């Protein structure tokens, strides 16, 4: 009955794609041919459920029904990894376990897409859902519809665009389990409020409430409920767009799968003119403590609503630190003899909180606007390697060039829009580093930062200093002497090889000067013109001459 | 000037809800600030009901501007009222949250903010 309820709402094609995505997101092991028969049988069973709601065992939950077909093939433990052990349990324990198991020619593809339109389209989502178990299911349906619409720069754009949404949804699903529902709803109030400053608190709280149900369902593998609901909140915003935003007019003309994607990406609405100070009803009011005591979370959510609608220049995390500090003082102050006099200067405590990221953005953008993406990425690779030298040389290069790439697509924008762009990118790379470090732990400080509240995840990383517990391991065993293999290819693409030479030189001589390290990197870039203009013969002469210069520092 | 059988059902649908509100408010008066204004909104929404019931009569007398903007804001006004009763019943004695409910533009957000105040109170 619940399966027939979802089959009727979602499209016939969209139902199929969703059950195929949900199967590949869990039993990623079974190849396309195994999963497609199960998807077909589930749609064929739901087809009967549409007609007779009581007959054929149409009464079971989507987790028992779509979790028994996922288990029929998943019988043996060898024809899957340690994930087949989940199968032994019964719902809701069964799906509780499946969650716990997180872990290529322009005219060649068209020869297979022309014969079977369905065989090519379903193949896009099968391995894209098996390669990204936490990708937003309704977004993946739109991603494939976009793919169905020259074929080299368009697919590269959709590869990079799809890489951003997958990473974004990993962060969303992570804050939900790791930091709670209230924490997600708190982010929701803030980012929605900046986006829709015209909307009254009740409409925002409606969006917060409906959006949490969407993302909670999507993370819990309730991928068919998620897409059905993401479409309903999208309809609601479009039906009541005056009560929400102005920007939504064009987004709502677009068809079903696009309509939702557009609203999500919608521009910040021109915040209502001449809004009063939050100080009046949050610091001055006689009933601040009485209203806070009444519905503590709603009063704080209202604080965030007003602060966020007025600060589209702040980060969502900054708005959360300001909400958290206000909550913290309200908690202590309401107990005091004169709560009013206690909290009367609360807003003056927000000053260092908003200064700290603005000062960091301005200090780092001053370096970016004077060094470029190469000499700024190089500078970040020296500082971030001295900070945490326990990171693997190529993983530290990747996160150094990735964190530098933030300054590139952030400093262009003015002081008014630098912070929300900087936080958006930085959060995404920090979660990609924390996901990579959780699997292979190398540093106890990185663990502390990733484990800390999502709010102060970036503040933690910025506080790090040079790890005084690192003994300069001066190898010089091929790491300090680069190979002349990339000399023959010769390209600015192989900049990672030149960068990895720097991160090994920092790790082997850590107490090196800021000018000393720039002189050893400038002499290394000059030595490349020997191997760019006796092929391997230049590497032996440059290896002996560059190592002679490094003897003047001897780290 | 359309759906006169569905307008009889539409009007009768609001009447059942106003009766539901009136019982819960008459009980409340010996069981929270909106209480005097709730009784004014009830009387004002009844004027719209009389207007509809007169429109039916006018069409029957005549040979026969389809305004749904009054109907929608009526349903949302009924929600702003019903929500304020669920909050008064919940023990919310705080004119901040009442205004937040009354400031809402949609009955959908009226209930979402209601449920939010309700859980936050516990």
UniProtKB/Swiss-Prot annotation, chain A:
Xref: InterPro entries: ALB/AFP/VDB, Serum_albumin-like, Serum_albumin/AFP/Afamin, Serum_albumin_CS, Serum_albumin_N
Q: Which residues bind Zn(2+)?
A: 63, 220, 222
Where N6-succinyllysine occurs, the residues are 178, 409, 492, 535
Marked site, Aspirin-acetylated lysine, at 172
Task: Name the GO terms of the biological process aspect.
Answer: cellular response to calcium ion starvation; cellular response to starvation; negative regulation of mitochondrial depolarization
Q: How is it modified after translation?
A: Glycated in diabetic patients.
Q: Where is this site: Not glycated?
A: 16, 37, 60, 69, 89, 102, 122, 145, 154, 163, 168, 178, 185, 213, 235, 247, 259, 332, 345, 362, 375, 387, 405, 409, 439, 448, 473, 492, 497, 511, 514, 530, 533, 535, 545
Q: Which residues are glycosylated?
A: 8, 47, 123, 148, 172, 198, 206, 249, 254, 286, 290-291, 296, 324, 351, 386, 412, 417, 467, 498, 507, 509, 518, 544
* Positions carrying Phosphoserine: 1, 54, 61, 246, 392, 462
Changing residue 509 to E has the effect of: In Castel di Sangro
Q: Which Pfam families match?
A: Serum_albumin
Domain Albumin span(s) in chain numbering: 1-159, 160-352, 353-548
Quote the tissue specificity entry: Plasma.
A molecular function annotated in GO for this UniProt entry is: copper ion binding
> Which amino acids does the record list as binding (4Z,15Z)-bilirubin IXalpha?
213
What changing residue 338 to V does, per the record, is:
In Iowa city-1
Q: Which GO terms describe its cellular component?
A: blood microparticle; cytoplasm; endoplasmic reticulum; endoplasmic reticulum lumen; extracellular exosome; extracellular region; extracellular space; Golgi apparatus
The principal location of this protein is secreted
Outcome of mutating residue 63 to A, per the record? Impairs metal binding
- Pathological association: Hyperthyroxinemia, familial dysalbuminemic: A disorder characterized by abnormally elevated levels of total serum thyroxine (T4) in euthyroid patients. It is due to abnormal serum albumin that binds T4 with enhanced affinity.
Q: What is this protein called?
A: Albumin
Species whose genome carries this gene: Homo sapiens
Q: Which lineage is the organism of this entry classified under, starting from the top rank?
A: Eukaryota, Metazoa, Chordata, Craniata, Vertebrata
């Amino acid at each position: 009955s619940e399966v027939a309820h979802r089959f009727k709402d979602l499209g016939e094609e969209n139902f199929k794609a969703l059950v195929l995505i949900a199967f590949a997101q869990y039993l990623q092991q079974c190849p396309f041919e195994d999963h497609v028969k199960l998807v077909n049988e589930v749609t064929e069973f739901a087809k009967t459920c549409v007609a007779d709601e009581s007959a054929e065992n149409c009464d079971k939950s989507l987790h028992t029904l779509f979790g028994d077909k996922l288990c029929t093939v998943a019988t043996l433990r060898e024809t899957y990894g340690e994930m087949a052990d989940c199968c032994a349990k019964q719902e809701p324990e069964r799906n509780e376990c499946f969650l716990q198991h997180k872990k290529r020619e322009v005219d060649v593809m068209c020869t297979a897409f022309h014969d079977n339109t369905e065989t090519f389209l379903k193949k896009y989502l099968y391995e894209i859902a098996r390669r990204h178990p936490y990708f937003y299911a309704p977004e993946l349906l739109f991603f494939a519809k976009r793919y169905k619409a020259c074929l080299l720069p368009k697919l590269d754009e959709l590869r990079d665009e799809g890489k951003a949404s997958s990473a974004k949804q990993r962060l969303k699903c992570a804050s939900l389990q790791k930091f709670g529902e209230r924490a997600f709803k708190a982010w929701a109030v803030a980012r929605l409020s900046q986006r829709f400053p015209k909307a009254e608190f009740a409409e925002v709280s409606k969006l917060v409430t409906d959006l949490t149900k969407v993302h909670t369902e999507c993370c819990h593998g309730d991928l068919l409920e998620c897409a059905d609901d993401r479409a309903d909140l999208a309809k609601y915003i479009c039906e009541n767009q005056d009560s929400i935003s102005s920007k939504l007019k064009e987004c709502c003309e677009k068809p079903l799968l696009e309509k939702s994607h557009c609203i999500a990406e919608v521009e910040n609405d021109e915040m209502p003119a001449d809004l009063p100070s939050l100080a009046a009803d949050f610091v001055e009011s006689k009933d601040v403590c009485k209203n806070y005591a009444e519905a503590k979370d709603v009063f704080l959510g209202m604080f965030l609503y007003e602060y966020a609608r007025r600060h589209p220049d702040y980060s969502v995390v900054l708005l959360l630190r300001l909400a958290k500090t206000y909550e913290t003082t309200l908690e202590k102050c309401c107990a005091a003899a004169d709560p009013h006099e206690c909290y009367a200067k609360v807003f003056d405590e927000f000053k260092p909180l908003v200064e700290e990221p603005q000062n960091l953005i301005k200090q780092n953008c001053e370096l970016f606007e004077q060094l470029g993406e190469y000499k700024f990425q190089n500078a970040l690779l020296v500082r971030y390697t001295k900070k945490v030298p326990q990171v693997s040389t190529p993983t530290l290069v990747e996160v150094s060039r990735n964190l530098g790439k933030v300054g590139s697509k952030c400093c262009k924008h003015p002081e008014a829009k630098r912070m929300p762009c900087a936080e958006d990118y930085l959060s995404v790379v920090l979660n990609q580093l924390c996901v990579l470090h959780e699997k292979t732990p190398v540093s106890d400080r990185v663990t502390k930062c990733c484990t800390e509240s999502l709010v102060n995840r970036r503040p933690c990383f910025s506080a790090l200093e040079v790890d005084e517990t690192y003994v300069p391991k001066e190898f010089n065993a091929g790491t300090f002497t680069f190979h002349a293999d990339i000399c023959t290819l010769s390209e600015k693409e192989r900049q990672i090889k030149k960068q990895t030479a720097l991160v090994e030189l920092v790790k082997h001589k850590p107490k090196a000067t800021k000018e000393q390290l720039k002189a050893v990197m400038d002499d290394f870039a000059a030595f490349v013109e020997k191997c760019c203009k006796d092929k391997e013969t230049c590497f032996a002469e440059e290896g002996k001459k560059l190592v002679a210069a490094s003897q003047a520092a001897l780290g | 000037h359309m759906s006169t059988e569905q307008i009889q059902k539409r009007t009768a649908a609001i009447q059942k809800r106003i009766a539901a509100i009136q019982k819960r408010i008459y009980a409340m008066t010996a069981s929270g600030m909106s209480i005097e204004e709730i009784t004014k909104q009830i009387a004002a929404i009844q004027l719209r009901i009389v207007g509809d019931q007169v429109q039916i009569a006018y069409q029957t007398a005549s040979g026969a501007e389809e305004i749904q903007k009054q109907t929608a804001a009526i349903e949302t006004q009924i929600c702003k009222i019903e929500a304020a009763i669920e909050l008064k019943e919940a023990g919310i004695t705080s004119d901040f949250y009442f205004e937040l409910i009354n400031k809402a533009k949609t009955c959908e957000g009226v209930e979402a903010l209601k449920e939010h105040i309700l859980a936050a109170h516990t």
